[PDB]
Structures are given as structure tokens and as C-alpha cells.
Amino acid sequence: MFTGSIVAIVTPMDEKGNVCRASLKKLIDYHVASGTSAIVSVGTTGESATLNHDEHADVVMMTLDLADGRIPVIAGTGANATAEAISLTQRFNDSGIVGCLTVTPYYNRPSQEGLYQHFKAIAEHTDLPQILYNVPSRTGCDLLPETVGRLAKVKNIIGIKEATGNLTRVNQIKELVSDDFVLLSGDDASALDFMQYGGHGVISVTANVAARDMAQMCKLAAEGHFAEARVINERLMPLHNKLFVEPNPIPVKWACKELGLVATDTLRLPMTPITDSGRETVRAALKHAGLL
Amino acid sequence: MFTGSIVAIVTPMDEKGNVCRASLKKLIDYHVASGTSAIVSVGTTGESATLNHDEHADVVMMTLDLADGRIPVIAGTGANATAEAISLTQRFNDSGIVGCLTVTPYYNRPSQEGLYQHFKAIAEHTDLPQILYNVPSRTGCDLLPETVGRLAKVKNIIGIKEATGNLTRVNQIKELVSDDFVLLSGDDASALDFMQYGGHGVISVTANVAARDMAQMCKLAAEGHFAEARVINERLMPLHNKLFVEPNPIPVKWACKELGLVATDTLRLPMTPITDSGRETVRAALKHAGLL
């Protein structure tokens, strides 16, 4: 069962914007050493939007190769066209990934029935576990609990990354699905609360640069030690907030570079370099976490 | 300049979801007869999301062919990766299109500076007029007037499809740009108001099925005869609303079929068929307009 601190890992790039293998290796080694539960490869934080489908496949396969069985890998496989979602998913069949993270279609704003048919078709063209992903602030679409309940009855649909920050969704979903269906936070700032309300873990931006503390916090939460978890969360709260001072993953890539975890903080357009003001904001947050 | 009633044309499909040339021809003939000012090919209403790159290029080239110089064509060229947007734009250089409609990157939520660099790079890889397209409800991104001002100094960047329905944007933009820069409504329900506030036209879904009326309304608006323009808008007001209760272009494709303009109302997933309530309200709206 997917649980704990799952990193939405950045896709580290060289100065030309190509995937930087040495830096990816360093990040993967860091998450193994830190006790990160799993890696989400080419999620939103991994710049899924600006990698073409073959580059996307390359990054996931590279992540599996470097992981070398030490840490589970979940592939980002979301698309706003159902045919493309199916194709991406089929690409990773028998790759070694343990699951797929698949976002509600963005931009075209399908209905709840559209969302149902989309994810059902995807699930029917795979043997891999499927984690649904709702983030209306990015997509223009809000996958409601009722529809999640319908999808949870479909073979292979086994969880959700709920990124609304709306804590009422936890029990609204939980009462419509079986006890084995996983609820994962997609909002670092509210993730500990999300777990205390019944969530099983978090797919996290913060875990990129505070992997040890995130893993400890999620462990404590799982054990019901929320007082202790809250101390860590408060330590990390400036990071939870300031990693979004400029658009994700601009701040977190800078932070990775600053901590020596990656060679460069290069992104692909329309993502642009962190401003000087952003640098200092993020630096302060890293200092608050005892990381700088 | 680009003015008047510009149709965001549906991409008619057969039962298998493949582009239907016979129906596309009928629509184009209809727009020539109806006095539509131009056609936007493979915009949001044209299911840009679910056509692959080659299909997208094919629809644009077929539309140009069938237009046969009788009506200007504008290609949808938007993408959430700057490299992809540049490639799409380059595909249509020397195609015969008169301009491009290019939406703010969706899903990845760039900064205003990201938007500036995105659209600047696109503009620098073409000689074609660029119409920026802002629709935050679909993209998670809002291109602000200040940024539009900066972009309007870039060569080739000559207008905006403003789809917020926020009438305050009209003059917040106009005051920062040249007299030749065009403001076009991307929101049918507020399009006459938008023109009354200083806008130059509309990129319309309603024009798909009420082309003559939309053309007349925009003409009366441009002439300053808003009382008379209102009579037409009141006639179309139910269509302006009911073409969007279920996700666009599901309603408008059904309406096209009901009027005999296309052979089938088929869409591609994650779009799904119109519901019973949809059929009834859209049918009523068509009757209200005197079209059925």
C-alpha cells in the first residue's frame, strides 16, 4: 500500500535543458538514504508539461535504472486526451514502475462523466496500480468525491493524490471507497492535517530538499504521534509555503542546487529562472529547516 | 485588423472520431454565406486537446483548402511548452493562414515573466500576426494587462482574445497598447458588453450555429447601434448560456447536427455525449434564436 513521504522529484537539467543523469543519480541516492517511501517521476514538479513523450519515457526509465530496486518508482502518466493517456500508460507496462499518477484532464474541462470514462479507459488498458490526481487550480477541473467513489470500483484504480488543500475531501472520499483505497495529500502546507484526518501519506514538493524530515514526519503521523509530527511540520512550514513563492518547480530546483543536490537549476520555458527576491525567500525557509 | 464575428469552428468528426471533410466543407460554406469575418481553426472549440500534431495540421490545411481564399483562417497554435508552441507555429508558416491564436500555457502555471518570454519567443519565430488568448478558468493562468502591454511592443503581437468576461480588462489593456491592437471577446455571454466597453469583435462559439446573427450584431455594435445589437443578443442569450452548461464543444456540436450543418455530433474522450437535459435546453435555445 502506498504510504508515507513520496517525493514528486524534480527532473534535474543541465544548462541546455536536457536531463542531467549525474544529478538525478545524486537525488535518487539521497532519497534512498533519507527514507523516502517512493519516487513520483515526471509529475507536475518534474516538468511533465515541457518534456516530450520520449523524453518523458527516458526520464522514468533512467529513474528506474538508477533506483536499481532500492526505492519504488511511480510514473507520471497524465494527459488531457484519453488516447494519449492510454499510450503513455502502455509505454510503461512491464517497465518496473509500481504505479501511475494520472491527473484529471486539464484545459478541456470534461464533465464528471468525462472524468469517469477517461480514467476507466486508462485503467482498462493497464495492469498497473492507478493513483488519480486532482488539482483544480492547475487543471480547471474538480474531480468530486462521488466520481472518485465510482472510479474506486474499477480494477486498478487504487488511490488519489488530492491537491485541493480542502480537508473535507478526506472523509468524503473515505466513506465512498474501500479501506484499502489510498488517500495521499498533494498539498505540502496541509499534508500533516490531511494525514490526521485519515490520509495515508503525501506526494510532496518539500521532500525534494527535506527528505529526512518529511519521512520522519509521515512516520510519526502513521504512528499517531501528531504532537511530534507537528514540531517537524512547523520547522518545515516556511518551506511548504515558500517553495511556491514563484511557480513550482522554480523554487525547489534552486533549493536543490543550493544544497548541492543538483548541478544546475535550469528549467524549460515557460518556466523561468528564480528572481533574486525569490532566492532570498527560499534561502530563509531552508535556514528555518536547519538545512542551510 | 481582425474584427467582427470570428467563429471558433468545431472540428466535425465521423462516428469513429475522425475528422469529417464533407461536414467541415458545409460549415465553411455556411460561414462564407453568413458573413463571418474569419475562422479560428483548432481552437478550444475545435478540440485542440485531443487532436495529435499531424491531425491538427491536417484540419488547418483542409480548412484553408475548403475556404479557397473566400474567408480568412486563423490557426490555433497554443501550447504549454514554448518549444512545442514554436514548432506548431513553424508548421503553419506559408500555409496561407492570416494569423495565429495562441493560449497562455495551461497546467504548469508560469509567472507573468514566463508568459512574456513564452509569447516573445513564439513571436520571434514567425512573420504571422499573433493573437494572445487568456482564459484562466481553463488554464490556471491569468495574463494580466501589464504583461499584455509589454508583449504588444513585440513585433507580430497584435491582439488578445480575452475570455475572462471581466469587462474592466478591456480598457486596462487598451490604455497600454497601440490603437491598432485588437481586443476580442472570448466569452459569448458578455461579448456585446465587451464591444460596448471598447472591444473590436468576438471569437465566438455561438457563431457556429447563429453565424448570420452574430455577424449582424457585431456590425451594429461597430456602428454604435447598441439598442439594435441588443435585440439580436437577447435572441441569442439562451444559446450563449446553454452552449456552455455541459462542456464546450459538446453542446455546440449537437446543435450543429440538429441544424444539419454536420453529419455527426461525435467528440473525442474525455468529451462525452450530450445529456437529455442538454439536448432539451440547447434545442429550446435554438428555437429562441429562430433557428429551429
User: Which of A50, A117, A138 is the closest to B270 by Cβ?
Assistant: A117
The verdict on a CB contact (< 8 Å) between A270 and B106 is no
Neighbouring CB atoms inside 10 A of A20's CB total: 20
In this structure, what C-alpha cell is assigned to residue A205? 514538493
Is the Cβ pair A269, B121 closer than 8 Å? Answer: yes
Q: Is B39 annotated as a binding residue?
A: no
Residues in chain B: 292
Domain ranges for chain A, please list them. 1-292
Distance from C-alpha of B131 to C-alpha of B127, rounded to nearest angstrom = 13
Kindly report the backbone phi and psi dihedral angles of residue A83, in degrees, each rounded to the nearest multiple of 5, phi listed first. -55, -40
Note which residues in 26-65 of chain A have CB less than 8 A from chain B. 44, 47, 49-50, 52
Strands (E) in chain A, as ranges, are 4-8, 38-41, 73-76, 99-103, 130-134, 157-162, 182-185, 201-204
Strands A157-162 and A130-134: parallel
Contacts of A118 in chain B (CB under 8 A): 269-270
Instruction: Tell which phi-psi region holds residue A4, choosing left (phi > 0), alpha (psi between -120 and 50) or beta.
Output: left
Q: Which residues contact B78 (CB under 8 A, 6 or more apart)?
A: B48, B85, B88, B101, B102, B103, B104, B133
The CA distance from B228 to B290, in Å, is 17
Residue B4 backbone dihedrals phi, psi, to 5 degrees:
75, -150
Query: Which contacts of A143-149 are long-range, i.e. CB under 8 A and separated by 24 or more positions?
Result: A143/A104, A143/A112, A143/A115, A144/A112, A145/A169, A145/A172, A145/A173, A145/A176, A146/A112, A146/A176, A147/A112, A147/A115, A147/A116, A148/A173, A148/A176, A148/A177, A149/A173, A149/A176, A149/A177
CB B249 within 8 Å of CB B226:
no
**Is A45 one of the annotated binding-site residues?**
yes
B128: phi then psi, degrees, rounded to nearest 5: -85, 140
DSSP 3-state of A64: helix
Cβ-contact A199, A183 below 8 angstroms? yes
Rama region for A271: left / alpha / beta (φ>0; ψ in -120 to 50; rest)? beta
Return the CATH superfamily for domain B1-292. Aldolase class I (3.20.20.70)
User: In whole angstroms, what is the distance from residue B115 CA to residue B138 CA?
Assistant: 16
Check: CB of residue B39 under 8 Å from CB of residue B66: no
C-alpha distances (whole Å) from B173 to each of A169, A211, B151, B193, B196 are 39, 45, 11, 16, 15
Min distance A248 CA to chain B CA atoms (Å):
8
**How far apart are the C-alpha atoms of B143 and B146, rounded to whole Å?**
8
Within 13 Å, how many C-alpha atoms sit on residue B234's CB side?
A: 6
